[PDB]
Design a protein around this ligand. Sequence first.
Ligand SMILES: [Ca+2]
Length: 431
Amino acid sequence: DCSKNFTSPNGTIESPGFPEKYPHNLDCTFTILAKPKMEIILQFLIFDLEHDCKYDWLDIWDGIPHVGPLIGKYCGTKTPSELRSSTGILSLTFHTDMAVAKDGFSARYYLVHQCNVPLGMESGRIANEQISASSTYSDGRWTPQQSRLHGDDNGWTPNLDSNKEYLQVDLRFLTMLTAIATQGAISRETQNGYYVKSYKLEVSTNGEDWMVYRHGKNHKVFQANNDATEVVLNKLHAPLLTRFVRIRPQTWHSGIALRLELFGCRVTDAPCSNMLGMLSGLIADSQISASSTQEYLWSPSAARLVSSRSGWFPRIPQAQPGEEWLQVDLGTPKTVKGVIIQGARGGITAVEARAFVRKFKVSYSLNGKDWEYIQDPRTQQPKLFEGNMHYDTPDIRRFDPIPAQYVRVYPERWSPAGIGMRLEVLGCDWT
Ligand SMILES: [Ca+2]
């Protein structure tokens, strides 16, 4: 048996037989488990796999393998970037085929103890490998890794200065973003000052479905710099739950040069705000159910925040308000303090094709049989929660804490395509 679990405060994870070459025909699962308020830190020391990772690979998973999100798939000679997870579970599945073996890998994991924290551009906590761009200037002197705030060596500049370029950051885990700070840059070679004067923001949970950030009807244009040295910070009028962030310059002085910091926090930094297992897969399929489901090709995993490639859809998605529900059995009683609601993906090129919930109700139960709705203190009736404005970008909706083993989300309003929904529940231990 290849597979292993790791619970000790500090440890080693490695390819079978390391430092010998790795065996053929392997499929191993390495899982690190941590109790709450503990951060998992994973650092690679050696990495060397056969090289598109079509043959041999190491997949890293934000939870359970093939259930929770894929953080990345790695092969070849380039060691994975360091990972810091606050999910409570980090998994690795190492796959090898019938021929060709290399040295493999060796890694170490550690278990260690206002949403306004810098996310790591200036600290280096955002690794070089997490930063990329649509293009870069042809001399190699204005690279994406030169886009860190207060960097002493130029900045990021694209191949050609237009409004179709972007600096991209992969935060690896779903993270709250609350502000962006930018600078221009002064040429060490020439003394010319270059800066971006305005930008747009584009975000995704998965790298494939993107949302340009709006203020009202229209795309938000953030005003940026007025010199090549001073930091201009913009606070987002509405904070964002995201993984991938793109900064997309719209205007500049003399040319696009960019230095950047991102500000925010973890979902769990708020009290009683642990993700209870839909995203990760610690809530099993058997614990997920609905009033109705699409008649063919339904798996309960379709309902899972972020990891699902589609969504829950009732049997007739153009339903009756308050009749359809998605239920989560948390497995044991909990204190529940919110949900994260998301739209349905798959099929995006057509705006009217996008299925998402715009308004909803919540009920909860310890019985599984007797249900109470969450109340509006004003109208003395079931509270109508705001849903999503987009099919990928999720929205956290907190409420006054409640004791529950079961939670139901009842779609009330929804996009023209009908009800489509992915979900997570937020809370902590019952007390
Ligand atoms: Ca092989």
